[PDB]
Amino acid sequence: DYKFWYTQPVPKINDEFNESVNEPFISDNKVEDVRKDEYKLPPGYSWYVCDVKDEKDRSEIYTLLTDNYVEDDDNIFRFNYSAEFLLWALTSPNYLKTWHIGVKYDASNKLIGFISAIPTDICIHKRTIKMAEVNFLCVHKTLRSKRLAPVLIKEITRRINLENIWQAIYTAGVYLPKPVSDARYYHRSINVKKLIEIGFSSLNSRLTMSRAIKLYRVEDTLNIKNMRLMKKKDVEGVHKLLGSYLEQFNLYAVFTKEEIAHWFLPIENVIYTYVNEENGKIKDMISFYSLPSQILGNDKYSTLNAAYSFYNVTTTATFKQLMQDAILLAKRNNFDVFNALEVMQNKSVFEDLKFGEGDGSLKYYLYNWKCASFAPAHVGIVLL
Ligand SMILES: CCCCCCCCCCCCCC(=O)SCCNC(=O)CCNC(=O)[C@H](O)C(C)(C)COP(=O)(O)OP(=O)(O)OC[C@H]1O[C@@H](n2cnc3c(N)ncnc32)[C@H](O)[C@@H]1OP(=O)(O)O
Ligand SMILES: Cc1c(CCOc2cccnc2-c2ccnc(N3CCNCC3)c2)c(C(=O)NCC(=O)O)nn1C
Ligand SMILES: [Cl-]
Ligand SMILES: [Cl-]
Ligand SMILES: [Cl-]
Ligand SMILES: [Cl-]
Ligand SMILES: [Cl-]
Ligand SMILES: [Cl-]
Ligand SMILES: [Cl-]
Ligand SMILES: [Cl-]
Ligand SMILES: [Cl-]
Ligand SMILES: [Cl-]
Ligand SMILES: [Cl-]
Ligand SMILES: [Cl-]
Ligand SMILES: [Cl-]
């Protein structure tokens, strides 16, 4: 079908471009020609600009997502982003409040739809372009398949265009026209009994309960003994270490110093970053963020508390040793499982460190940009 997406500046499902192509579908755009009127909504619905710095507006978004956002392929789990997490993810440097858009049902004054974007500098095939990073598209379950999502997309495109920005980046679990890369996800069990009780991990005659507990047990000693929580004094060094690491990839964000402080300085129950400092220099770093999933229907446990691999760089140890420490630090902060995508160098440690393959993949997309696609080991960016 793709009745909507084939009207947009994106590749068709069979399009394929070679390395000589790296440019927009539509160039020479003028801000003056962008529509000045908001898109029409059905009778009884209105646009609403959300202020995520206000606790009440932030809680309205939280409630919408907790009840209606992404579920796994089998409808066992639903993401449960915390309200503090949403604050962090949506207030990066130079964010625009008018790019946090909602749709209200006027008769009850309830939020039933949402989409957001934040500005970012993206390097694709060595070209750096100012882009919007789009996320948290959600329509209330009672209003699905009514073609409301295309309206949310067109309205946010209009508002991004009004700022003279014409490219975007986004990720989704569903296959749309057309991914630039596609990355399976993997899991590493930490709380073995909990994962068994909820029916996610499986046992058999070879892998009994006691053997599984033994298999996934980790030693409580760090390979990099001076790993410690990142502080404001570490921003400059993390900026240099991560910047140098990311330049090898075909797709990655170009961070400013201010952006490094926002995305990595630790926040309890949201973002964790550890560093190894030697001779005044940051030589190694580990980071992971907190994203629990609701266990739908379970009356014993509210959530599975997962840590998600963010950005990890090592110069004094092997990558296997570094990610072994990452798992231990997640365990020390009481996380139940450590999740990761097959981007950057992550695939090289999955077998040895006893990760298990998931049942789906995350696709990476660009809007109004045509280029060759690439394997996910060349992806160097993680969206939230
Ligand atoms: C330069 C600036 C540009 C900025 C804009 C950049 C583009 C941004 C695009 C968005 C980036 C978002 C990044 C994230 O947040 S990805 C996570 C998305 N959210 C969820 O999965 C939560 C649970 N599900 C829902 O809330 C609804 O099912 C959604 C809202 C997903 C669709 O609602 P509904 O189920 O009620 O359907 P409809 O009848 O209204 O509309 C049908 C059309 O929608 C196309 N569809 C389905 N799923 C997605 C999807 N995940 N990305 C893009 N398009 C999608 C579908 O192919 C069809 O098009 P076509 O096949 O007819 O052509
Ligand atoms: C789909 C899902 C998963 C599968 C894990 O999916 C990932 C694993 C690692 C990284 N990313 C993803 C992922 C998959 C689909 N969409 C996204 N998005 C949407 C678009 N914006 C960015 C984020 C991310 C889990 C889960 O892991 N439970 C813990 C356990 O089973 O152990 N719970 N649910 C609801
Ligand atoms: Cl085609
Ligand atoms: Cl103009
Ligand atoms: Cl309207
Ligand atoms: Cl709701
Ligand atoms: Cl559903
Ligand atoms: Cl239209
Ligand atoms: Cl068996
Ligand atoms: Cl400090
Ligand atoms: Cl719980
Ligand atoms: Cl390898
Ligand atoms: Cl596996
Ligand atoms: Cl490739
Ligand atoms: Cl790969």
Numbering used by the authors: 27 to 410
From the article:
Strikingly, however, replacing the morpholine with acetate caused an increase in selectivity for a pyridine core (9c) and a sharp decrease for a phenyl core (8c). The electron density, however, is weak for the tail group extension of 9c and indicates multiple conformations. Two copies of 9c were built into each active site. However, the tail group and extension of 9c are unstably bound, with six conformations modeled. Of these, two consistent conformers (observed in more than one chain) have the amide carbonyl directed either toward the side chain of Asn365 or that of Ser319. The carboxylate does not appear to form hydrogen bonds with the protein. In the presence of the 9c dynamics, the His213 side chain adopts both inwardly and outwardly pointing rotamers (A and B, respectively), but considering all three asymmetric unit copies, samples the B state with higher occupancy. The pyridine of 9c draws a water molecule closer through hydrogen bonding thereby enabling the incorporation of an extra water. Within the complex with 9c, the N4 ammonium interacts electrostatically with the side chains of Asn161 and Thr197 and the carboxylate of Leu410 but is situated in closer proximity to the side chains.
